[PDB]
From Swiss-Prot, chain B:
This is Spike protein S2'. It comes from Severe acute respiratory syndrome coronavirus 2. Changing S10A: In strain: Alpha/B.1.1.7. It comes from the Viruses. Subunit of the fusion protein that is processed upon entry into the host cell. Mediates fusion of the virion and cellular membranes by functioning as a class I viral fusion protein. Contains a viral fusion peptide that is unmasked after S2 cleavage. This cleavage can occur at the cell membrane by host TMPRSS2 or during endocytosis by host CSTL. In either case, this triggers an extensive and irreversible conformational change that leads to fusion of the viral envelope with the cellular cytoplasmic membrane, releasing viral genomic RNA into the host cell cytoplasm.
Length: 48, 48
C-alpha cells in the first residue's frame, strides 16, 4: 500500500500507461499492474 | 486503426495498443495459414 497527496486534477494521471509531470517525475506505475487505486478529497482537513 | 506496429505503440496506451497488436497478429497468421493450405493441396496434384 502507498499513500500521498496530489494537487487534484492529476488524479487521472496516476493510472498505468499515462504521462505527465507528476506520473513522469515522482511516481510511476508498471505496465502490467493489478492492484486497485483509491482517492478522496481532503480540502477541509488539509487546506489552510 | 493503423497498419504499423510502432505507430500503434506511439499513439495509444498499452492496453489498447495490445488490442491492436493482437488484431494485426491474428490477421497475418491466418493469411499465412491460407497460403500454406493452398500450397499443400497443389503439391498433391503435382505428385500425381
Amino acid at each position: 500500500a502507498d499513500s500521498f497527496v496530489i494537487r487534484g486534477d492529476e488524479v487521472r494521471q496516476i493510472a498505468p500507461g499515462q504521462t505527465g509531470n507528476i506520473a513522469d517525475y515522482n511516481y510511476k506505475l508498471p505496465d502490467d499492474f493489478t492492484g486497485c487505486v483509491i482517492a478522496w478529497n481532503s480540502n477541509k482537513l488539509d487546506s489552510k | 486503426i493503423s497498419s504499423v506496429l510502432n505507430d500503434i505503440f506511439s499513439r495509444l496506451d498499452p492496453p489498447e495498443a495490445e488490442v491492436q497488436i493482437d488484431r494485426l497478429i491474428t490477421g497475418r497468421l491466418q493469411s499465412l495459414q491460407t497460403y500454406v493450405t493452398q500450397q499443400l493441396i497443389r503439391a498433391a496434384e503435382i505428385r500425381a
